[PDB]
């Protein structure tokens, strides 16, 4: 049951070519075609194959000075590395056509750093208009080192060195099985071996390979360092997207807190220690990730300069708030204008659009970059190419760190402060003339854990022979992930006059920790959007049914790249990998329930789909509306002036079936 | 290049069996001898393989329960693990004869946590009187994961997975080379990314494999949890040995500081942040080693309880000092005697002797153990068998962490406070009637770096096929400090004729000031180079003494591959046999300067009193009733160190070739 889609042999060929770059990523098959091309490809000679003369010359000047060497860890948060990554991005992006693009990537694969290559390649494929419709495999299949602890990795390594198992039945005791010609390794979350604070309750969520892969997709669809000029309409809305993404992510995460009895995301100070440490169990082929003990004093000698920066960055904003109206960055900004959200978001991401430029520049110091460094607790980089990575140097790992959520909670809250300048909507804007919701009904909402496997083959090094015969796909990791049963939502509406309408579905908490009901006044930002759609109303009474698996904001699991090869032989590609790349995985839609049924609420909004004066189709097939994202919960609400006949709040309860605890799935018997 | 000992046939058979347990420590060979003997070994029905019945049944009770599972990290600093290691050592030690000992060992090597086995097995060989003379692989060949920085370990792991070098020339540029069908990986000492501070100036001593082995050896020769009654008369001097060991070590270490522009070992407080952090490139295939940032607050919630403990343990000591005399642990102690020095050391080590018992008990808490847990920075163990490791969790990694020297500097100072109670040496106790040193001359003293190999095959996994041939050939190459041999010649005028003791010490000549050290504040900073007895003639004579002969320094360990070849010839290396627990020669001198770095050589001659006829736990125990470190075992009045039988000589320590070791590891 995988949503498919049919394709021609020209596609399959290009698609196989694109996919070839993701196989055995840390090595060279000097037999493969990609090698022959790559070895000899003369870039200077091919200058006429690029849309941009100077991007080629800028690159070639960079390349003659030398790029980041092989094997070292790449991260986009460091100046010289970013600039090489962008330089290579441009080269990919300005390739005349596919042929040129492909030969260019072959060169880059053979000669450049692999994390650098992959980072740029990945973005290029999402960005090149002639690649829209193509499929890239899951980031966890591409960087499996980033999506798994030391324990699994070492087992995998041990098995490769021995070239199999010395003892099938001793292997079984270690969660290592042979099925077919595959090695399957069971893997626990890190709390099964480490419980250093309460945040360890949530590792099935923060360590979820889907969630982390999600954040890397989000970054790749629009890098902070690149303008959004290519997405037209989205440009005047970039800041709003930035807010909305984090606001959503944090509501979802907060929900996981409530069901695990953990309450609000803690605030911190640049001048005080921060409470909760992180102790990464991840390995870099060159180094260990940095640890932040509990009660880490943010303000020590090595941070004095970085913290002076963060503080002014924040204070300048407090000053914008106090000023209401002001000229910043060559733009007059007014805080009572809701459109100022563009500037607000851009300011916090320090993205290229803040300056109205193509690419950010070194001297445009980023707040997020320096927060990540400060909170990362790493010692100072050794040189331009050599740093001590923390979870927060990578999009693939950021969600693993409790401090990640505290950082962006911080930024979101400051944005909420600005939101207080927006007038709350009146009756008039929210009221659907002659339309009323009479009931909403939901199927039982249940969560449960079920096993999930992925190809971890890139973490392993193969011999010259194995690379030839192409036995290079034999390592799978088995890990319990959260999931939920499909459920329906019945909306019963009355309308006297037939007309087109938008239906919106939101999920929210019902109580704080004291068990007092959520007022809207305080809690409008803790609402999580489940679904957007339209229907045709008729005079009288209608029943609208919508399945959880028709929900537009979520996708199915990626399929392993091995299965994509099987399918491409039939002329098929899985739909959700192609145009639903960067949505959250469906299985993580709901927070883990409790066995007695945890109290939430479901909010259902129905409003007229008038025309489509302005609709998002550029980056996201998202707001086909002139409506702010998260409409109507995009600004502070007044309980009294808010509720109208076309809104319905229904009390809902989230259950859980089978084992409550992931580790219970990895016990050998 | 090495001193050999002829060795008979019975010995070679036994030595070989012993060394064979150290092969491929990390997996099991279904076709090896040890495996078949382990399977044939009915532990149940062989109570009569053992001297001690209690020890036998004790182990059985425990074994019916279960021991630390295979693959996990072993550390003797965690209670349940220690109790299990001790039980297994009891078994090894009480084995009726060498046969039962071998079988037990095979048995343990198969069914038990390998780290726990190696620990117990090492110690057993050193302690069993029928094994006293046999040799052991260097600690870096048995536990190479504790002597290899992560970058190197990974380079090896990926070469194994690849089954060799894809392309010699990429490999070369990464410091990987083929030699006699063996892989050699070049290794740098860690950069500011490992010691994010000044302590990185010294990484070439603190990471040095000899120095770390040395510490492992000193522990195994007499473990804190054991009784010293096996060494009879030595038991009355156990605390003295404990002081001397750390005092010497810290004196040596401070000399390395001075030549790298570094000054005094910082002092610390349990209630304040510790300035100097440590980030180890080590992992236990489960957790990476715990990091300690710079300015890490020792007194945080998870340490409240342990600091309380460490704080009274210290203050109890102060109260001793204040009271002069008192009862403690049975005894009535008077700080004016030597039954005192011994007690003081034992106190600080919470060793078995302090309680007058055979083994440390479950509930007797150790200062050193909790000091190390607090300084080590690790989150609290997950359960009985699973802790997060730090450098201070192992004898073989301890010397790598700046905090280690700070911890022992603290203890040693407290002992120096006690030493103020000791009555100073007088003119008459130091003067050698009718003997005088007229001159001391010394050859050029020159340090330098050169390459050293060891086999790291023990942290590489092999297939069923490969194992059938017990495989090695994964060698690590590293620049290591070293010196050129030199001669000390002493000129002596004397009236009559006796045996003399000649002693040589090395001390600093100036502090970080540039100011001359006075003996009052320097006696603790001298480390012993040598000890020997001499027949003195009437009149004028010259004693010549080469560095290669210095009593307290050893040659390098040979790797097993070489040991095997020597054994094939009827030979073993003397130093691995007669003196493994001695510091290596190459580290005899601290790195000099091209310049020449100013130190002083102290030469002491005193009358020899033929005494003790013993059986030595360390080579630091020389057949003399004088204190260890005499005449620098205690506070000095500088005006008695002018006897004609003393000579202080200024020497300058030079250096040659490259000053920085990393220039020894650059590609083309
Ligand atoms: C993920 O995380 C979870 C939680 O941490 C892990 O779950 C743990 O899994 C352990 C197994 O690896 C399990 O331990 C076993 O418990 C059973 C039930 O009591 C015992 O039968 C086992 O004991 C055997 O092994 C011991 C040492 O390894 C021996 O001391 C002992 O002798 C025994 O061997 C057997 O007993 C006979 C002795 O008379 C012997 O003759 C016979 O031949 C047998 O071999 C284990 O102790 C944990 O209990 C379990 N934890 C929990 C809370 O359930 C999970 O493994 C992790 N998964 C992965 C994939 O990493
Ligand atoms: C132990 O530690 C030492 C010191 O850190 C380390 O030595 C360093 O090694 C690297 C390579 O291994 C070496 O740099 C190579 O450097 C050479 C020399 O370049 C010289 O000349 C340049 C002008 O022509 C000048 O710009 C330089 O400053 C320098 O004086 C250079 O030829 C190499 O060039 C590059 O090759 C790489 C291939 O990966 C490409 O990525 C890149 O495009 C270039 O073509 C290369 O940079 C460096 O100089 C050494 N460092 C020092 C301080 O001397 C050891 O390698 C390390 N050993 C082990 C075994 O771990």
From TrEMBL, chain A:
Keywords: Secreted, Signal, Storage protein. Gene3D superfamilies: Di-copper center containing domain from catechol oxidase, Hemocyanin, C-terminal domain, Hemocyanin, N-terminal domain. InterPro entries: Di-copper_centre_dom_sf, Hemocyanin/hexamerin, Hemocyanin/hexamerin_mid_dom, Hemocyanin_C, Hemocyanin_C_sf, Hemocyanin_N, Hemocyanin_N_sf, Ig_E-set. GO terms for molecular function: nutrient reservoir activity. Its main location: secreted. Residues 424-656 form the Hemocyanin C-terminal domain. It is found in: Secreted. It holds the Pfam family Hemocyanin_C. GO terms for cellular component: extracellular space. Residues 11-133 form the Hemocyanin N-terminal domain. Residues 138-414 form the Hemocyanin middle domain. Belongs to the hemocyanin family. This is Arylphorin. It comes from Bombyx mori.
TrEMBL record, chain B:
The keyword Amino-acid biosynthesis does not apply. Residues 138-414 form the Hemocyanin middle domain. The keyword Plastid does not apply. Its main location: secreted. Residues 424-655 form the Hemocyanin C-terminal domain. Disulfide bonds join 49-100, 165-171. It is found in: Secreted. Pfam families: Hemocyanin_C (PF03723), Hemocyanin_M (PF00372), Hemocyanin_N (PF03722). Residues 11-132 form the Hemocyanin N-terminal domain. GO terms for cellular component: extracellular space. Keywords: Secreted, Storage protein. One of its GO terms (molecular function) is nutrient reservoir activity. Belongs to the hemocyanin family. This is Silkworm storage protein. It comes from Bombyx mori. The lineage of its organism: Eukaryota, Metazoa, Ecdysozoa, Arthropoda, Hexapoda.
């Amino acid at each position: 049951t995988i949503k498919t889609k049919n394709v021609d042999a020209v596609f399959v060929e290009k698609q196989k070519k694109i996919l070839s770059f993701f196989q055995d990523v840390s090595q060279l098959n000097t037999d493969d075609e990609y090698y022959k091309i790559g070895k000899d490809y003369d870039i200077e000679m091919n200058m006429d194959n690029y849309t941009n003369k100077k991007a080629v010359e800028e690159f070639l000047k960079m390349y003659r000075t030398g790029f980041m060497p092989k094997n070292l860890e790449f991260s986009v948060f460091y100046d010289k590395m970013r600039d090489e990554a962008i330089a290579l991005f441009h080269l990919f992006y300005y390739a005349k056509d596919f042929e040129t693009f492909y030969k260019t990537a072959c060169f880059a694969r053979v000669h450049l750093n692999q994390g650098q290559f992959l980072y740029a390649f990945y973005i290029a494929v999402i960005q090149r208009s002639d690649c829209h419709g193509f499929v890239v495999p899951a980031p966890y299949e591409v960087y499996p080192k980033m999506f798994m602890n030391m324990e699994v990795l070492q087992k995998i390594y041990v098995t490769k060195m021995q070239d199999g198992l010395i003892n099938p039945e001793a292997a079984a005791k270690y969660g290592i099985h042979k099925e077919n010609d595959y090695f399957v390794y069971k893997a626990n979350y890190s709390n099964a071996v480490l419980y250093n604070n309460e945040e360890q309750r949530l590792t099935y969520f923060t360590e979820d390979i889907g969630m982390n892969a999600y954040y890397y997709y989000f970054h790749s669809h629009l890098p902070f360092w690149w303008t959004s000029e290519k997405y037209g309409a989205l440009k005047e809305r970039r800041g709003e997207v930035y807010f909305y993404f984090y606001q959503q992510l944090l509501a979802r995460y907060y929900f996981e807190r409530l069901t695990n009895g953990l309450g609000k995301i803690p605030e911190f100070s640049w001048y005080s220690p921060i409470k909760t440490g992180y102790y990464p169990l991840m390995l870099t082929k060159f180094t260990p990730f940095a640890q932040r003990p509990d009660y880490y004093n943010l303000h020590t000698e090595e941070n004095y300069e970085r913290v002076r920066f963060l503080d002014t960055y924040e204070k300048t904003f407090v000053q914008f708030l106090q000023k209401d109206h002001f000229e910043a960055f060559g733009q007059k900004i007014d805080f009572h204008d809701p459109k100022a959200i563009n500037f607000v978001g851009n300011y916090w991401q320090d993205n290229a659009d803040l300056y109205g430029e193509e690419v950010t520049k070194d001297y445009q110091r980023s707040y997020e970059v320096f927060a990540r460094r400060v909170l990362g607790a790493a010692p100072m980089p050794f040189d331009k190419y050599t740093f001590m990575p923390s979870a927060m140097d990578f999009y693939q790992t950021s969600l693993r760190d409790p401090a990640f959520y505290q950082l962006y909670n911080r930024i979101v809250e400051y944005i909420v402060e600005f939101k207080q300048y927006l007038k709350p909507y009146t009756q008039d804007k929210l009221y659907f003339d002659g339309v009323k919701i009479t009931d909403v009904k939901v199927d039982k909402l249940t969560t449960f854990f079920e096993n999930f496997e992925f190809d971890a083959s890139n973490s392993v090094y193969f011999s010259k022979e194995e690379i030839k015969n192409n036995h290079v796909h034999d390592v799978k990791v088995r890990q319990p992930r959260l999931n939920h049963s499909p459920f329906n939502v019945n909306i019963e509406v009355d309308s006297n006059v037939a007309s087109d309408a938008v239906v919106k579905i939101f999920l929210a908490p019902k109580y704080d920790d004291n068990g007092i009901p959520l007022t809207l006044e305080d809690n409008w930002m803790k609402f999580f959007e489940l679904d957007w759609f339209t229907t045709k109303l008729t005079a009288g009474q209608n029943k609208i049914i919508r399945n959880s698996n028709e929900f537009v904001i979520f996708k199915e699991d990626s399929v392993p790249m091995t299965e994509i090869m099987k399918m491409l032989d039939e002329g098929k590609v899985p739909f959700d990998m192609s145009e639903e790349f960067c949505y959250m995985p469906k299985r993580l839609m709901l927070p883990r329930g409790t066995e007695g049924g945890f109290p939430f609420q479901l909010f259902v909004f129905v409003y007229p789909f008038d025309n489509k004066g302005k609709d998002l189709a550029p980056f996201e097939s998202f707001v086909l509306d002139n409506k702010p994202l998260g409409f109507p919960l995009d600004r502070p609400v007044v309980d009294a002036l808010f509720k109208v006949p076309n809104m319905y709040f229904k009390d809902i309860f989230i259950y859980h079936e089978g084992e409550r605890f992931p580790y219970k799935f990895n016990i050998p018997s | 290049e090495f001193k050999t000992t002829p060795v008979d046939a019975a010995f070679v058979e036994k030595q070989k069996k012993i060394l064979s347990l150290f092969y491929n420590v990390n997996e099991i060979s279904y076709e090896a001898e040890y495996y078949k003997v382990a399977q044939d070994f009915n532990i149940e029905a062989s109570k009569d393989c053992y001297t001690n019945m209690k020890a036998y049944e004790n182990f059985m009770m425990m074994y019916k329960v279960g021991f630390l599972p295979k693959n996990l990290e072993f550390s003797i600093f965690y209670e349940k693990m220690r109790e299990e290691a001790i039980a297994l050592f009891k078994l090894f030690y009480y084995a009726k004869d060498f046969e039962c000992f071998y079988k037990t060992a095979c048995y343990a090597r198969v069914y038990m946590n390998q780290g726990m086995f190696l620990y117990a097995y090492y110690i057993a060989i050193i302690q069993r009187s029928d094994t006293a003379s046999f040799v052991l692989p260097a600690p870096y060949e048995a536990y190479p994961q504790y002597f290899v920085n992560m970058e190197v370990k990974n380079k090896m792991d990926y070469v194994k997975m690849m089954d060799g070098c894809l392309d010699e020339k990429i490999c070369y540029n990464y410091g990987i080379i083929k030699e006699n069908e063996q892989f050699v990986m070049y290794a740098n000492y860690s950069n500011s990314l490992t010691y994010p501070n000044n302590e990185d100036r010294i990484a070439y001593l603190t990471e040095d494999v000899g120095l770390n082995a040395y510490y492992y050896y000193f522990h195994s020769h007499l473990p804190f949890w054991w009784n010293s009654g096996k060494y009879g008369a030595f038991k009355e001097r156990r605390g003295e040995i404990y002081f001397f060991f750390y005092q010497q070590l810290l004196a040596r270490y401070y000399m390395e500081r001075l030549t790298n522009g570094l000054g005094k070992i910082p002092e610390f407080s349990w209630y304040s942040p510790l300035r100097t952090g440590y980030l180890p490139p080590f992992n236990s295939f489960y957790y990476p080693f715990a990091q300690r940032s710079n300015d890490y607050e020792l007194h945080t919630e998870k340490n409240y309880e342990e600091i309380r403990f460490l704080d009274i343990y210290e203050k109890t000591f102060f109260q001793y000092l204040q009271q002069g005399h008192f009862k403690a642990f049975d005894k009535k102690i008077d700080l004016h005697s030597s039954k005192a020095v011994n007690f003081v050391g034992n106190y600080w080590q919470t060793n078995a002797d302090l309680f007058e018992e055979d083994f440390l008990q479950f509930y007797q808490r150790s200062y050193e153990v909790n000091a190390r847990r607090v300084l080590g920075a690790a989150p609290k163990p997950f359960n009985q068998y699973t802790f997060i490791p730090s450098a201070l969790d192992f004898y073989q990694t301890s010397a790598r962490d700046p905090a280690f020297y700070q911890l022992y500097k603290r203890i040693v100072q407290y002992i120096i406070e006690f030493k103020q109670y000791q009555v100073p040496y007088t003119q008459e106790a130091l003067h050698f009637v009718g003997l005088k040193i007229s001159d001391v001359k010394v050859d050029k003293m020159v340090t330098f770096f050169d390459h050293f190999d060891f086999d790291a095959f023990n942290t590489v996994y092999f297939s069923k096929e490969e194992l059938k041939s017990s495989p090695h050939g994964y060698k690590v190459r590293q620049p290591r400090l070293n010196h050129k041999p030199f001669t000390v010649t002493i000129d002596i005028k004397s009236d009559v004729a006796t045996n003399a003791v000649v002693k040589m010490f090395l001390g600093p000549k100036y502090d970080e000031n540039g100011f001359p050290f006075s003996l009052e504040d320097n006696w603790m900073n001298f480390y012993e180079l040598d000890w020997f007895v001499q027949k003195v003639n009437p009149g004028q004579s010259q004693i010549t003494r080469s560095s290669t002969d210095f009593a307290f320094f050893k040659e390098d360990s040979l790797p097993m591959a070489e040991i095997y070849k020597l054994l094939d010839q009827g030979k073993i290396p003397t130093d691995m046999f007669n003196s493994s627990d001695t510091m290596p020669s190459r580290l005899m001198l601290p790195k000099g300067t091209y310049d020449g770095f100013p130190f002083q050589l102290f030469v002491f001659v005193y009358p020899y009193e033929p005494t003790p006829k013993e059986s030595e736990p360390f080579k630091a125990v020389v057949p003399d009733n004088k204190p260890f470190g005499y005449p620098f075992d205690r506070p000095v009045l500088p005006q008695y160190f002018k006897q004609p039988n003393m000579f202080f000589k200024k020497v300058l320590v030079y250096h040659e070739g490259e000053l920085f070791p990393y220039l020894f590891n650059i590609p083309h």
